[PDB]
Amino acid sequence: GLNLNTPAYVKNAKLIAWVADMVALCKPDTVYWCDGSDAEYQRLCQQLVDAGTFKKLNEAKRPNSYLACSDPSDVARVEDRTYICSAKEENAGPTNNWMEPSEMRATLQPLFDGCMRGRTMYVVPFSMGPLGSPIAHIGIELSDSPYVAVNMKIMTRMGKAVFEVLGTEGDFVPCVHTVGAPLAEGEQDVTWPCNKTKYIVHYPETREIWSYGSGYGGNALLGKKCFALRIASNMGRDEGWLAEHMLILGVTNPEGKKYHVAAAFPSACGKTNFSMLVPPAGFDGWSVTTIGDDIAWIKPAADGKLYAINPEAGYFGVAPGTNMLTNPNCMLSVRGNTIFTNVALTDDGDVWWEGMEQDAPGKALPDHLIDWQGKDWTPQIAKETGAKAAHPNSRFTVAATNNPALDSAWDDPKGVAIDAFIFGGRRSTTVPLVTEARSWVEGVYMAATMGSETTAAATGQAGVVRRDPFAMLPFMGYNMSDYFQHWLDLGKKLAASGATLPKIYTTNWFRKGTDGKFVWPGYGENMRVLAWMIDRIEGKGQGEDHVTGISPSYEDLNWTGLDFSADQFNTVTSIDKAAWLKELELHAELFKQLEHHLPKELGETKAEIERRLAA
Ligand SMILES: O=C(O)C(=O)CS(=O)(=O)O
Ligand SMILES: [Mn+2]
Numbered sequence: 141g142l143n144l145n146t147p148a149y150v151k152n153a154k155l156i157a158w159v160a161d162m163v164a165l166c167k168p169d170t171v172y173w174c175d176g177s178d179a180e181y182q183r184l185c186q187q188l189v190d191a192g193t194f195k196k197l198n199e200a201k202r203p204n205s206y207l208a209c210s211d212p213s214d215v216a217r218v219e220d221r222t223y224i225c226s227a228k229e230e231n232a233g234p235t236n237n238w239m240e241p242s243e244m245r246a247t248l249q250p251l252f253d254g255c256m257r258g259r260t261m262y263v264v265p266f267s268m269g270p271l272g273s274p275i276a277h278i279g280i281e282l283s284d285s286p287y288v289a290v291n292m293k294i295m296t297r298m299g300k301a302v303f304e305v306l307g308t309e310g311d312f313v314p315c316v317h318t319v320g321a322p323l324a325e326g327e328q329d330v331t332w333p334c335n336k337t338k339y340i341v342h343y344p345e346t347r348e349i350w351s352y353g354s355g356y357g358g359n360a361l362l363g364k365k366c367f368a369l370r371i372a373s374n375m376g377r378d379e380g381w382l383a384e385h386m387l388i389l390g391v392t393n394p395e396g397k398k399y400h401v402a403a404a405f406p407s408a409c410g411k412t413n414f415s416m417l418v419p420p421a422g423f424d425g426w427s428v429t430t431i432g433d434d435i436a437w438i439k440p441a442a443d444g445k446l447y448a449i450n451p452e453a454g455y456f457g458v459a460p461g462t463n464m465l466t467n468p469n470c471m472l473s474v475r476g477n478t479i480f481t482n483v484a485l486t487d488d489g490d491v492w493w494e495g496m497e498q499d500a501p502g503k504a505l506p507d508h509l510i511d512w513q514g515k516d517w518t519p520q521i522a523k524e525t526g527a528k529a530a531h532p533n534s535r536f537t538v539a540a541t542n543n544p545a546l547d548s549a550w551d552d553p554k555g556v557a558i559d560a561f562i563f564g565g566r567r568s569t570t571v572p573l574v575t576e577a578r579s580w581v582e583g584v585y586m587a588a589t590m591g592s593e594t595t596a597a598a599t600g601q602a603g604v605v606r607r608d609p610f611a612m613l614p615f616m617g618y619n620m621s622d623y624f625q626h627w628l629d630l631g632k633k634l635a636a637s638g639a640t641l642p643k644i645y646t647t648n649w650f651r652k653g654t655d656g657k658f659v660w661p662g663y664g665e666n667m668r669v670l671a672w673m674i675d676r677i678e679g680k681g682q683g684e685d686h687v688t689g690i691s692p693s694y695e696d697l698n699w700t701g702l703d704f705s706a707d708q709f710n711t712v713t714s715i716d717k718a719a720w721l722k723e724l725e726l727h728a729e730l731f732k733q734l735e736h737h738l739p740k741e742l743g744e745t746k747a748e749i750e751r752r753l754a755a
Contacts, residue, residue: 144171149300151308155280159263162282162316167254168261174289176265176299184286192331193287198489203476207491208287209512210482214334214356216533217365217407217598219614221353222340224370226618231344233619234733235609244341251320251339251352258323259284265303266296268368268451272305273553275437275449277372279313281362285333285355288317291479294454294537296363313347313371315362320353342366344374344617357456357481357535365615368435368451373617377626381439385611387415388432388448388556390547391670394425399674402436402448403562403647404587404611407597408533410564410649412457413663416469416545420664421701423671429547430469430540431556433457438558440630444639447555455543458597459483459534461495466663469545479537482512484529493530532596559677564647565592565608570719571648573660573712574669575689576676580631582689583644585745588624589727590646607730621737628739645673646688651712660712661704668697687715687752717753724750 142163146156150173163171174180185206188194194206224232225241232238239247262283269276283289292298306312320335335353342349349366351359358365372383386402405411415433419426432450440446455473459480462470474480484492487508497505505519511529521527540546549556563586565571577583592608594600607613609620616623634641647669649662672692675681683690691713694706727746731738 142168142171145173147173147175147300149303151303152306152310152312153308155306155312158314159280159282163261165249165252166256166261166282166284166316166318168256168259168284171261171263173263174265174293174299176293176301180299181290181293184290188286188290191329195485197480197491201488201490202478205476205478205480205491207480207483207485209332209514210356211330211332211334212513213336214332214354215482215531215599216356216596217358217614218338218340218354219598219600221338222614224342224344224617226344230736231618231622233616233621233736235613235616235620241343241345248339248341248350248352251337252316252318252350255318255320255322255352256284258325258327260286262286262289264289264292264298265300265306266292266298266363267302267305268296268363268372269437269449270551270553271297271301275553275555276305276451277313277367277375278302278306278310279315279363279367281315281317283317283360285317285319285360287355288360291361291456291537292363294479294539295361295456296453313349313367315349315351315367317351317360317362318353319355340366342370342617344371347371361456364435364452364456368437369612369615370617372437372451373612373615373623376437376439377618377622381437382626382630383617384436384438385434385615386436386448386561387411387434388436388450388558389415389417390429390431390549390556391674392427392429393671393674397678399559399677400431400448400556401560401562401670401673402438402558403564405564406566406592406595406608406611407614408458408595409566409592409611410662412455412470413467414666416467416543417667417670418468418545418664419667422698423667426667426671428545428667428670430543430545431547431550432540440634442637444634444637445557446634446642448558449553449555450550452540454537454539456535456537459493459536460528460530460532462493463495463498465498466495469543472544473538473542474536475542477539477542480535481537482531482534484512484517485510493534494528532602558642560643560645560673561587562645562647562673563587563590563610564649565590565611566595566650567591567605567648568593568650568652570716570723571646571651572686572688572691572715573648573651574672575646575686575691576673576683577644577646577689580635580641580644581628581741582745584624584627584631585742586644586646586688587627588742589730591723591726607726609730619737621734621739624734624742625737625739628741643673643676648712659708661702665702665704668699668702672697687720687749720749720753724753
């Protein structure tokens with residue numbers, strides 16, 4: 141077979157055999173094993189510069205940073221091309237796209253046969269979770285994209301140290317990726333190779349992941365969504381733990397007590413902002429620290445507590461909207477050593493995106509930019525056509541250790557105990573600012589039934605309300621109704637210890653007024669809601685019983701430093717009977733679709749809410 145160039149530190153016979161089999165199938169010109177060093181990163185970045193995929197940014201303005209721009213067909217996740225190919229269709233469920241595995245294997249084999257002709261196969265070894273810790277799991281991604289290799293170096297623990305952990309017999313998650321654009325001898329490549337035809341396929345029984353045609357984000361960085369959510373949710377369902385689309389933060393009040401909170405918001409609905417929240421005026425003595433902004437692996441312990449870890453090593457965050465008001469910790473994080481994707485280029489070799497003008501003199505747009513499609517951009521063009529200099533799904537990739545607010549336990553494999561869960565969709569109407577569930581079952585209900593308006597994080601029409609249970613609609617690895625039962629069963633195990641269960645909240649930062657603008661100021665002001673949750677955790681916070689749960693009164697929040705009247709508070713906390721009667725009918729349609737294995741407790745909770753609305 142082809143010379144694999146297998147390094148001497150690879151002692152795993154089964155792994156080498158697997159690579160040999162994949163090289164026989166994909167037929168790359170050469171094979172390169174990524175060792176994960178900083179020196180290699182710089183070499184691969186310089187290689188990307190030569191290919192035109194990367195532009196190096198001005199070293200004086202943005203040290204050791206690069207900008208990539210993608211093909212306009214390859215800018216986001218493609219949910220319609222993402223499949224869970226379980227042996228039985230009922231174990232994919234109605235929220236997933238399924239195909240008989242042998243039938244998908246016959247569909248993909250011609251696509252991957254020779255997919256890497258004219259290209260290099262990069263072997264990308266990685267650990268999700270701290271290296272060699274009891275909770276970590278190892279993957280190997282074979283890819284023909286050097287863009288994948290360098291982004292994986294930031295987002296995971298990548299490289300030769302993985303093989304010390306694997307040893308001769310360790311198991312691993314097998315991942316194969318190709319941009320699906322094989323090159324003929326002497327053929328000129330493009331700056332962003334991709335294919336109009338795309339598949340992102342998961343075989344849960346074998347833990348296999350196959351990705352074809354996209355080089356972008358969660359389609360191609362296979363440790364992040366494919367492994368650490370879709371495959372990991374199957375593993376945790378069988379082994380007693382959870383893999384969740386949740387940030388994890390720590391918060392310390394002036395008396396020095398520290399709590400931790402996990403929040404599930406859908407894609408591009410404020411996780412990165414909340415996980416790095418800076419307390420505003422009126423909260424002297426409070427501090428917020430980040431454990432993670434996207435993925436949480438959680439399991440119960442004998443002491444009755446729920447322990448969470450962040451399995452990633454960096455941030456892959458939405459760029460537009462980031463500035464010193466909305467997320468200063470993130471602004472400081474991306475001062476250097478960052479990869480930017482699909483943002484705009486300034487005349488001085490820096491980057492720009494919509495929202496940055498809030499920090500500019502006169503809050504004014506730049507005079508001239510090159511947009512993410514390479515076209516000239518000016519404020520006049522933006523005024524007359526609304527052209528976006530940065531694509532709405534543009535991204536920064538940056539190490540977690542760049543974050544000034546990073547928690548000291550961010551990479552502690554013992555985890556942090558979770559004192560409260562938060563669920564929240566992007567809802568222009570109906571859902572109030574914050575509600576505490578009356579019981580664990582009612583909390584699971586609120587998580588199961590949450591809705592959210594679609595965003596640019598996946599292709600398709602943005603701004604449409606859809607059901608997104610637990611913010612896991614694009615990421616649940618098995619039948620969504622069985623997952624609801626898993627959460628119910630987890631609560632029973634915790635309660636049997638005698639412990640008090642974590643509280644569950646529903647939030648909504650995104651109610652709109654008649655002009656389409658947000659009625660709640662949000663961002664740093666979200667601390668005022670978080671501090672009520674802390675009060676409630678301590679047993680010191682008051683609240684009123686409403687239809688959907690317990691909500692604070694105006695006098696229960698701290699308004700020092702914010703001019704927000706009791707009338708504006710009533711607007712974002714009033715439970716509107718008609719809006720909720722309509723909302724509960726949309727829950728019934730969900731329950732009809734998820735009828736198979738749907739826990740009876742959800743129907744019972746719905747009937748109790750229906751009674752409270754008709755009272
Ligand atoms: O869309 C999301 O939820 C993300 O975190 C971005 S991606 O990794 O899916 O590209
Ligand atoms: Mn995400």
